[PDB]
Amino acid sequence: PLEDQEENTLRELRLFLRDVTKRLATDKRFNIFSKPVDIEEVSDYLEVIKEPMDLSTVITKIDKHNYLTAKDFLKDIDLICSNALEYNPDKDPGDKIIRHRACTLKDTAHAIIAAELDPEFNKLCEEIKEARIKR
């Protein structure tokens, strides 16, 4: 009963997170982040990057109910950006474009959340997370 009301809120959160992710993934600038890095082409990617992340994996994690707060989701967005900056050199413009897109993907995600997510709803999500940890 308590659990069922929690479950409605979390469903509303996932709908929102899916909507945000759809907007990021359909933006052409972020196409390179919409699928895992091809570790066969980018043969040194796993040597350098210990936790790969991308928007299709984020979508999977939403559907698996891994995110109980927007901040949990934003941590994975942040990881996408952090990975891109750790991996891509900063000398040629073709590399710089990827780093620029990574930082812009991060800023966009945070800006959409800050602009659109209801702060009271966010706090309720955080309470549901905390409740489940402690029950």
Partner: peptide
């Protein structure tokens, strides 16, 4: 940062 070979060019 920038530790990897890169996504472009001949060696990736």
């Amino acid at each position: 940062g920038g530790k990897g070979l890169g996504k472009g060019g001949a060696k990736r």
